[PDB]
């Protein structure tokens, strides 16, 4: 079922924006790892508060799981199916540790870093960025502005990576993760794709 972070026993007052994340994040009802949950929440806490507040206004939740995402009712229908953009026969949704784009983001604890069932630099930021794109910013990856940034700069940050060069919504979610994962990755984004950096930066102003 899950418990809201604000209703759990986890202490989070030193986590930035804990009041808004307390209403967004859902942690498991069953024994999980306090370190993995704390690192995932503090990473989400790097997001500008205006964006997090808009997510709460749109009733977006981020549920942290200790099991495959397809065990949850919301994603059960994806069992046995190839994820969008994946080569057939290389993966099913049951093996995917995170999913975003709707009002309930699912993120499996312990699979945040690259290679842990996925190829993102940060699973929770990538998955959450999908819901921000589709719900909070009304499919902003489809705007003419973002389409121009994607065609020009996606090859600069993800050269010869068909996944990001084919799906602009995927370029958005991973650029969002680069912006918020660390000072280093944000600088990488700023150096290789300065217009994309500026676009992600302006999201906090769009959310207010």
């Amino acid at each position: 079922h899950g418990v809201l972070l604000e209703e759990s026993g986890l202490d989070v007052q030193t986590i930035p924006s804990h009041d808004v994340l307390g209403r967004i994040v859902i942690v498991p009802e069953t024994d999980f790892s306090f370190d993995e949950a704390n690192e995932t929440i503090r990473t989400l806490a790097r997001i500008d508060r205006r964006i997090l507040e808009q997510a709460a206004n749109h009733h977006i939740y981020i549920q942290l799981l200790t099991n495959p995402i397809t065990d949850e009712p919301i994603a059960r229908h994806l069992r046995g199916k190839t994820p969008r953009g994946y080569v057939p026969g290389s993966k099913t949704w049951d093996e995917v540790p995170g999913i975003g784009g709707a009002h309930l983001v699912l993120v499996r604890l312990g699979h945040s870093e690259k290679g842990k069932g996925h190829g993102s630099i940060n699973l929770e930021l990538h998955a959450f960025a999908h819901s921000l794109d589709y719900i909070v910013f009304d499919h902003i990856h489809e705007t003419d502005e973002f389409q121009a940034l994607w065609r020009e700069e996606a090859p600069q940050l993800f050269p010869r990576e068909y996944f990001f060069l084919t799906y602009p919504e995927e370029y958005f979610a991973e650029s969002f993760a680069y912006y918020y994962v660390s000072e280093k990755t944000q600088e990488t984004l700023r150096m290789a794709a300065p217009r994309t950096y500026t676009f992600i930066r302006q999201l906090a102003e769009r959310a207010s």
Partner: peptide, 7 residues
């Protein structure tokens, strides 16, 4: 829409 992470 169900959106996955990169492969």
């Amino acid at each position: 829409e169900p959106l996955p992470p990169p492969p």
